[PDB]
Write a protein that binds this ligand. Sequence first.
Ligand code: ZN
Length: 125
Amino acid sequence: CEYLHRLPKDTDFFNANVDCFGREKHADYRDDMGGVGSFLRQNYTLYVGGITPTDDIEEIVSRHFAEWGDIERIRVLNSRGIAFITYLNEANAQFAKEAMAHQSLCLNVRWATTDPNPASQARNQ
RNA sequence: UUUUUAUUAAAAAAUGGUAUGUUUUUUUU
Ligand SMILES: [Zn+2]
């Protein structure tokens, strides 16, 4: 093949326009947050949704996500099957997004929305 | 005083006839 079959590592920066996964990044960031991020905003966390079996959702998603890259933050909603793993790098984040879609933990993986938390926005900034 | 010749056209759409307007959520602390 003409593309790397290995996993992104820490220093694998790419140009801002190009998606780190080889695709191209638009500007509108879509409406359903589906395919590829926007070069106008820099986010590393992605919505993953789907099964809500039991209380061990945190550990199952941690096991099923840490093997895709380096993790900075994980927040899982207990009431509903929603998790918001935050990755350290764009490369690992987008690789995980394209690797955890329609998989078994089907997962409804999307891009995260702007935080409404006045406290979370401050620490993110 | 014998014979004539002269030949337009012409089908389709909208008016016009099963109006129209509405309509599904990822974080707060
Ligand atoms: Zn390949």
